Amino acid sequence: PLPKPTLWAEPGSVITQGSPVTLRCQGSLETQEYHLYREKKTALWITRIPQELVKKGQFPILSITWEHAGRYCCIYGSHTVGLSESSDPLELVVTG
């Protein structure tokens, strides 16, 4: 039951439409085993983030749309030493 990671948004969780935002998750080790997800509805855009970013715990959105809004959580963890708990939810809001 590893510690839950820290998930945040840059510049923030409320970003106007068409503008960029990057979701970020940092847990323990340097890199390499992060996973982001949206909970009531799968966020397909996550499955397209290159491994190089995902390994750094980075999930960019260059041009945010309405369908991006939702509740996001993430967990890290290596086969061993094991998977972590879900971070607290991030409310990703889109406006304008």
Residue numbers in the entry: 2 to 97
Sentences from the paper on this structure:
LILRA3 is a soluble protein, the only secreted member of the LILR family, and contains four Ig-like domains (D1, D2, D3, and D4). Further, LILRA3 is the only non-membrane-bound LILR, and its function was predicted to be antagonistic with HLA-binding Group 1 LILRs. Here, we report the binding properties of the LILRA3 D1 and D1D2 domains to HLAIs (classical HLA-A*0201 and non-classical HLA-G1) as analyzed by BIAcore® surface plasmon resonance (SPR) analysis, as well as the crystal structure of the LILRA3 D1 domain.
Based on the previous observation that the first two domains (D1 and D2) of Group 1 LILRs are responsible for binding to HLAIs and to determine if LILRA3 interacts with HLAIs, the first or first and second N-terminal domains of LILRA3 (D1, residues 1–97; and D1D2, residues 1–197, respectively) were expressed in Escherichia coli, followed by purification from inclusion bodies, and renaturation via dilution refolding method. The overall structure of the LILRA3 D1 domain has characteristics consistent with Ig-like domain structures and also displays properties unique to the LILR family. The structure is primarily composed of β strands arranged into two anti-parallel β sheets, with one β sheet containing three anti-parallel β strands (A, B and E) and the other containing four anti-parallel β strands (C, F, G and A′). Like the crystal structure of LILRB1 D1D2 and B2 D1D2, the D1 structure of LILRA3 also has a pocket-type hydrophobic core surrounded by the C and E strands and two 310 helices between the two strands. Most of the hydrophobic residues on the strands and the 310 helices face toward the interior of this hydrophobic core, which causes the hydrophilic residues on the adjacent loop region to protrude outside of the core. This hydrophobic core not only contains some important residues for direct binding to HLAIs but also pushes the adjacent hydrophilic residues (e.g., Tyr38, Glu40, Lys41, Lys42 and Glu68) to assume a proper conformation for its binding to HLAIs, unlike the residues of Group 2 members and LILRA2, where the two 310 helices between the C and E strands cannot be seen by helix-strand transitions. There is also a disulfide bond between cysteine residues 26 and 75, which clearly indicates that of the two neighboring cysteines (Cys74 and Cys75) in LILRA3 D1, Cys75 provides the correct conformation for native structure through its disulfide bond between the B and F strands. Again, the crystal structure of LILRA3 D1 displays that Lys42 forms a hydrogen bond with Glu68 of LILRA3 D1, rendering Lys42 unable to bind to Asp96 of the α3 domain of HLA-A*0201.
